[PDB]
Design a protein around this ligand. Structure first.
Ligand SMILES: [Cu+2]
Length: 124
């Protein structure tokens, strides 16, 4: 199944957001990160991807489709706006096994606030 996450200057959660900021998908599903506003990218956060995955990094303004295969929780960031909390969480599968590793990953304060909230939104 194919899902879409927008990269926005403004959304329901404030400035510089992925919308939705939390998304649960099945293994083998895809997510397209859409440059609805310009100036953003999407890339893997360090320490917030499960074993079996591959890190990725899109270019600014690239409409970027990722197939998520390895079960677990994934943090993603926009590099331009990481410091502003432009992050998202994709959960692949149920009962993610890498929660404690991803909760311990270090992030800018605004990013950590948003990640903690997305994780809790997901019931983690
Ligand atoms: Cu951005």
């Amino acid at each position: 199944a194919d899902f879409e996450v927008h990269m926005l200057n403004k959304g329901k959660d404030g400035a510089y957001v992925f919308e939705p900021a939390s998304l649960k998908v099945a293994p083998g599903d895809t997510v397209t990160f859409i440059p609805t506003d310009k100036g953003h990218n999407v890339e893997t956060i360090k320490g917030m991807i499960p074993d079996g995955a591959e890190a990725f990094k899109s270019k600014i303004n690239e409409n970027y489709k990722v197939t998520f295969t390895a079960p677990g929780v994934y943090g993603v960031k926009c590099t331009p706006h990481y410091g502003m909390g432009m992050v998202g969480v994709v959960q692949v599968g149920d009962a993610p096994a890498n929660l404690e590793a991803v909760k311990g990953a270090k992030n800018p304060k605004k990013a950590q606030e948003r990640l903690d909230a997305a994780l809790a939104a997901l019931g983690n």
